[PDB]
Design a protein around this ligand. Structure first.
Ligand SMILES: *C/C=C(C)/C=C/C=C(C)/C=C/C1=C(C)CCCC1(C)C
Ligand SMILES: CCCCCCCCO[C@@H]1O[C@H](CO)[C@@H](O)[C@H](O)[C@H]1O
Length: 217
């Protein structure tokens, strides 16, 4: 499909501009803030690589009567934790709390990946595992991580809240897409499925980064 490839290109391109943009803004940054710029460049860069790889025809593996794009999940497993890290730096979390939110994040990504890789109905069981871990992650986001961020300057306090809403609201859509897309009910075509994910991936990553750069000043 030529349509799947262009959607992948659009993604790689959109991520590229995000990266270059963040790497530029990150250029010349204090020895106590570069961490943000550099993590933002990783979130964007990794995704860009993953998209170009898929655009090029790599990772399109068949499972049952569908095809699963492995580079998407590899990306997710590597990038979502960085997003949570970033959010964590804002909130002012320590190793303890960081550690908790990160693993909870990894379980849902690992479970989603495993789930999409199995042909049998037990895939729903794997999906269900990620579902419960995600509600947990969201709990920590709007809960303890929030109260924890309420101790920063009015500036940081407001940036975190905008980013967590953006995050929580958009991420909650992914599972439903998975459920309706080919991995589950396949009530959604691969192409629409991919178009939707590309958009979400872009906003929750590059959209995320730009909102942060705006705040930087
Ligand atoms: C840059 C990529 C991002 C922000 C990807 C986010 C993906 C999710 C929030 C996926 C969530 C899922 C569940 C909550 C249930 C298990 C199945 C998944 C992996 C689709
Ligand atoms: C890309 C967004 C970076 C935001 C960095 C906020 C750093 C706040 O740093 C703050 C004071 O000094 C320090 O507590």
């Amino acid at each position: 499909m030529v349509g799947l490839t262009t959607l992948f290109w659009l993604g790689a391109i959109g991520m590229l501009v995000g990266t270059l943009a963040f790497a530029w803004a990150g250029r010349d940054a204090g020895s106590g803030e570069r961490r943000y710029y550099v993590t933002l460049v990783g979130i964007s860069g990794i995704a860009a690589v993953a998209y170009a790889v898929m655009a090029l025809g790599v990772g399109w593996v068949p499972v049952a009567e569908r095809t699963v794009f492995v580079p998407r999940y590899i990306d997710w497993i590597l990038t979502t934790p960085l997003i949570v890290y970033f959010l964590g730096l804002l909130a002012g979390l320590d190793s303890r709390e960081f550690g908790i939110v990160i693993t909870l994040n990894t379980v849902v990504m690992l479970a989603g990946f495993a789930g999409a890789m199995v042909p049998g109905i037990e895939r729903y069981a794997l999906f269900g595992m990620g579902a419960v871990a995600f509600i947990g992650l969201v709990y920590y986001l709007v809960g303890p991580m929030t109260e924890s961020a309420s101790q920063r300057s009015s500036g940081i306090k407001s940036l975190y809240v905008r980013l967590r809403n953006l995050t929580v609201v958009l991420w909650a859509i992914y599972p439903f897409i998975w459920l309706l897309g080919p991995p589950g009910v396949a009530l959604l075509t691969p192409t629409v499925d991919v178009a939707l994910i590309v958009y979400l991936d872009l906003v929750t990553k590059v959209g995320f980064g730009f909102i942060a750069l705006d705040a930087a000043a």
